[PDB]
């Protein structure tokens, strides 16, 4: 068909269409957004201590706060 | 830690520079010694002429314009 007519155009349309589609079937986009969100620019600002809340951990060693563990493990 | 050293250093320049001003301007009429030009009772960030004022060139050129053309 047109593969003999204007071939570099057809290849451009093909790679264009797969570049459009391929982020829909993708098991890594949520990984991309978690990586991109979990990098802080400003200072992580503290807060006035507690209304006796079981969150906002006091030592930075305490894993009660939300951390990253899929970073070190690829 | 860097933040605490930075705050102590800028307040150090504020204290010494207003001491210099209080020594130097006792001739002009008017002139309260340490008025902000502003009205609100808030610590404004100074303007690098309140910090690095009358230091005669060398430190202000190595401080303001340092990173701008350091490599």
């Amino acid at each position: 068909n047109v593969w003999a007519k204007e071939p570099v155009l057809v290849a451009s349309f093909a790679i264009a269409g797969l570049a459009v589609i391929l982020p829909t079937l993708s098991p890594y986009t949520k990984y991309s957004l978690m990586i991109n969100r979990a990098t802080p620019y400003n200072y992580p600002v503290p807060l006035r201590d507690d209304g006796n809340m079981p969150d906002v951990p006091s030592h930075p060693q305490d894993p009660q706060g939300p951390s990253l563990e899929w970073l070190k493990r690829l | 830690l860097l933040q605490a050293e930075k705050d102590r250093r800028v307040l150090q320049m504020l204290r010494e520079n207003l001491e210099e001003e209080a020594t130097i301007m006792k001739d002009v009429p008017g002139w309260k010694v340490g008025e902000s030009v502003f009205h609100t009772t808030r610590w404004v960030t100074p303007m690098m002429g309140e910090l690095y004022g009358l230091r005669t060139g060398e430190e202000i050129l190595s401080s303001t314009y340092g990173f701008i053309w350091y490599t």
């Binding site: 570049a19 459009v20 982020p23 986009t29 991309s32 957004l33 991109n36 969100r37 990098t39 | 053309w69 350091y70 490599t71």
Partner: protein, 90 residues
Amino acid sequence: MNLMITLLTNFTLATLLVTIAFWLPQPFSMKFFLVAITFLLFDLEIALLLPLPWASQTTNLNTMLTMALLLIFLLAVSLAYEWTQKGLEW
């Protein structure tokens, strides 16, 4: 002013090379114009594209993909329009 020092040294040494090389021995077409304006407009669209590698670290990634594909897609539509409509022919 450090790169201004480099620029000054290169400029002065180049002028020394030239002046010591000189003191010592003694109509038009529209087709010329269409390519330059095509350069200009696609270069401005390059100027719109080129902060893309600055931007790729944000919390809005699907939207960035969509508008980046929209910019290259518009650039491709302009290209294919002047391609099909005898814009660059001889």
